[PDB]
């Protein structure tokens, strides 16, 4: 009871912190997947081994 | 514990050592208050006693 509902409170507060930043952190992380999928001359994946 | 040839005194000595082990192990919390990250949360833990 005590030690689990402490963890519930700490999760609730951390979500309360990082949410107004979390849209920024998501669209900052978006850079990395866009750069790993636009850098390579990519064909479909199964066939990639042929290239 | 030193009262040998008496099973009741020896067993009661071992029960006393077990409860004392509870105390010695719970002291480790207050040992580890010095971290940058464990520290504030151990401090936050002891503000919960009225709830």
UniProtKB/Swiss-Prot annotation, chain A:
Modified how: N-glycosylation is not essential for but facilitates cell surface expression, multimerization, association with lipid rafts and ion channel activity.
Location in the cell: Cell membrane; Membrane raft
Organs and tissues of expression: Expressed in dorsal root and trigeminal ganglia. Specifically expressed in a subset of pain- and temperature-sensing neurons. Not expressed in heavily myelinated neurons. Not expressed in neurons expressing TRPA1 or TRPV1.
Recorded phenotype for the gene knockout or disruption: Trpm8-deficient mice have severe behavioral deficits in response to cold stimuli.
UniProt remark on domains: Cooling agents bind within a pocket formed entirely by the S1-S4 helices that opens to the cytoplasm.
Family the entry assigns: Belongs to the transient receptor (TC 1.A.4) family. LTrpC subfamily. TRPM8 sub-subfamily.
UniProt function note: Non-selective ion channel permeable to monovalent and divalent cations, including Na(+), K(+), and Ca(2+), with higher permeability for Ca(2+). Activated by multiple factors, such as temperature, voltage, pressure, and changes in osmolality. Activated by cool temperatures (<23-28 degrees Celsius) and by chemical ligands evoking a sensation of coolness, such as menthol and icilin, therefore plays a central role in the detection of environmental cold temperatures.
Summary of subunit composition and partner proteins: Homotetramer. Interacts (via N-terminus and C-terminus domains) with TCAF1; the interaction stimulates TRPM8 channel activity. Interacts (via N-terminus and C-terminus domains) with TCAF2; the interaction inhibits TRPM8 channel activity.
Protein name: Transient receptor potential cation channel subfamily M member 8
Source organism per UniProt: Mus musculus
Covered range of the whole protein: 969 to 1019 of 1104
């Amino acid at each position: 009871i005590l030690l689990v509902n402490l963890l519930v409170a700490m999760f609730g507060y951390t979500v309360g912190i990082v949410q107004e930043n979390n849209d920024q952190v998501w669209k900052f992380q978006r850079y990395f997947l866009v750069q790993e999928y636009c850098n390579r001359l990519n064909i479909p994946f199964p066939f990639v081994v042929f290239a | 514990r030193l009262h040998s040839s008496n099973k009741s005194s020896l067993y009661s000595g071992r029960v006393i050592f077990c409860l004392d082990y509870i105390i010695f192990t719970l002291r480790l919390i207050h040992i580890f208050t010095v971290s940058r990250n464990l520290g504030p949360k151990i401090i936050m833990l002891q503000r919960m006693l009225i709830d």
